[model samples]
Target: GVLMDEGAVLTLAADLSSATLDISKQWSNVFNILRENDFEPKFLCEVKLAFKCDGEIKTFSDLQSLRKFASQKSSMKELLKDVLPQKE
Candidate 1:
């Protein structure tokens, strides 16, 4: 069960729940943090998908959907951050 770090999740939750606009910036910041900490790279696909859906999220419910995606997936979250996609 590669559930995300509870603290990170709560941190993101709190961040999203706070007063702010352009929350994608926040997502980007948190995304990098998760990456540096070795968050599963595959999960970023889910996040990118979520980002693509509405572009920039502006509400808790919106963030929750993406958070759900990140939390629900069972994978190796210890992967190193891949800066570029591999050329297949």
Candidate 2:
């Protein structure tokens, strides 16, 4: 285990198309699993989360904004339909 204080910065990157749209839930799941393994939540006070899609990048300093952005993007993609490629 690594020792970290409240000010410790944790950065994470993910590919948007392959990442979960429910980013907040995914974060909660990660924390839950870590806590179950004795990792302290206090060490995760600062998070730098980012997502990349094509040549665009989106970042969030907190989970709330990340969740909101993900949901909004998902909904917009749904509404736009054919405007975005369905590359399944």
Candidate 3:
């Protein structure tokens, strides 16, 4: 392995702090409300992945729309029909 010296190690330590959740408070509020609404947590994952963001899912309005969509029993059943595997 290439040995890193003292300066190299200190720089690495400083950079590591930026790797945490680091999300803004407003964004965290959006996430908290969604979690309270019985949202599928797994589906809630990539809203802030920067290059991978894939939803209209960062505001109270977005959360309200999702809540409306999920509250419909017909839609949820249709979702289950797709999600549940058929017997082989």
Best by TM-score: 2
lDDT per residue as tens, model 2, 1-88: 7887577685555454444233343443456777888777655443555657446876666565554554457543454345434322
RMSD of each: 16.3, 13.3, 16.6
lDDT by candidate, in order shown: 0.39, 0.53, 0.42
> Which candidate wins on lDDT?
2
TM-scores for candidates 1 onward, in order: 0.18, 0.31, 0.17
- What 10-residue stretch in candidate 3 is worst by lDDT? 44-53
Model 1 lDDT at residue 80: 15
lDDT of model number 3: 0.42
> lDDT value for candidate 1?
0.39
1-88, model 3: which lDDT tens digit per residue? 7986565444433235653233455543455666788775654332432321134443322333444444453544354344443222
Q: Which stretches of candidate 2 lie over 4 Å from their true place?
A: 1-43, 75-88
Rank candidates, TM-score, best first: 2, 1, 3
Query: What is candidate 1's lDDT per residue for 12-75, written digit by digit as tens?
Result: 3335577433325444444576678887554432232322323454333344443544344333
Better-scoring candidate (lDDT), 1 or 3: 3
